[PDB]
Amino acid sequence: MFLPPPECPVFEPSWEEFADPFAFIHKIRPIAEQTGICKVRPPPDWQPPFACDVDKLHFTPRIQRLNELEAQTRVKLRDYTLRTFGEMADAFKSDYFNMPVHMVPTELVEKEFWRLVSTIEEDVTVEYGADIASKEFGSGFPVRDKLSPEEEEYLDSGWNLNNMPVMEQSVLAHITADICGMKLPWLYVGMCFSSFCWHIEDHWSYSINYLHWGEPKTWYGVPGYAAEQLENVMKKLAPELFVSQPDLLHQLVTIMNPNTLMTHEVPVYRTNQCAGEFVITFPRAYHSGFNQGFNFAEAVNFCTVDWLPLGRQCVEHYRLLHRYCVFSHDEMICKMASKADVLDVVVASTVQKDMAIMIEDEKALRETVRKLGVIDSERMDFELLPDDERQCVKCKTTCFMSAISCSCKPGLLVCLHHVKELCSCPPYKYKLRYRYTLDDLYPMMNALKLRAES
């Protein structure tokens, strides 16, 4: 009926290995990128303090229908307190099974979840919390400021997820743009059967997820190399999800039985994440799951230097699909280049290689555009435009290195792949808008080269 996928890798790093989270993720990457997800059990004495008043934490609940292959929208950025939500969640689970809330086997919850989502007769609706930290509901990890206890030793931990949007080895930290949906940690309050649909993280980034407390979270993960296999399977069984959407807050995702994927030769792995354990998702690794009961998790995206080539591939993939970007990859690269003197040495080396590809591609695109008859040009500071004012009309990519404009359509832009998609004017009426000349870009790359040599 339901055949559980094989278990994903579980790591138990020693203290020395657990020290640098980025060094450890780099160490386990050859194993875990084969499974998409993996579990990290921290050293036994790594125990961050969790303290909260369940009566003063409020949040707006989200409602969720549990029907396989039904379209759901990705969460965007009525009221429960944490106590009243917990009482609702506990009464729901215990009444669903007629068993004490904490005595329902996890195997049975898994079997029952995949039964109810597939039965048209069942009409189970659950609720959950999902948002970034705010004054009414803050991070589960300690943050600076009133007076913190001596458990401020977890303030500067690499595994304190609030430090991920600031650590140097995360290239997302250097982004000046306000991408709070991606840079800041998300807080997830779950209950029995509340679920996250199959998805990958934006720009094919990593994510790391910590379960602060509560009943386990059940995960299904698919390695990054099988991403296109999974999408082809879902295109057959749910074509309505693959209709192009007007913006980022309209993306369609769904619940789907992993046995359906396994039947179509898609490798799927599972794990039960328990309180105090991390789950790490790797670039382009599809994942979904559900909560066994009342719990509280915190998750954040991040990008290592290993990710830089994949991040460029992803934006190219977004362009082919006409999907909106969260940020401009080229803007991030150039921002780091302009800070080459204070960059980590290994970061500088990796950024330099990506920038060399960027420059070669940009040079060829400008040659192609010049051969189409675009002659006039002017420097343009793309980073000053709001993101929705610098998307290619055709493919929706966020422009930064260059774009084409015509005075007959004020404010509209196309990227250099879509010069023919702007208007019916002859190309000599167009202007190439460019952030940098080639003569600006090579010294920027040389700064990274010099920095990479100590």
Ligand SMILES: Oc1ccc(-c2nnn[nH]2)c2cccnc12
């Ligand atoms: O990558 C993710 C992992 C887990 C979750 C999650 N945990 N509990 N409920 N949902 C989640 C939610 C929204 C977006 N992404 C998510």
Ligand SMILES: [Mn+2]
């Ligand atoms: Mn996610």
Ligand code: NA
């Ligand atoms: Na159902």
Ligand code: NA
């Ligand atoms: Na994608």
Ligand SMILES: [Zn+2]
């Ligand atoms: Zn375009």
Ligand SMILES: [Zn+2]
């Ligand atoms: Zn025109």
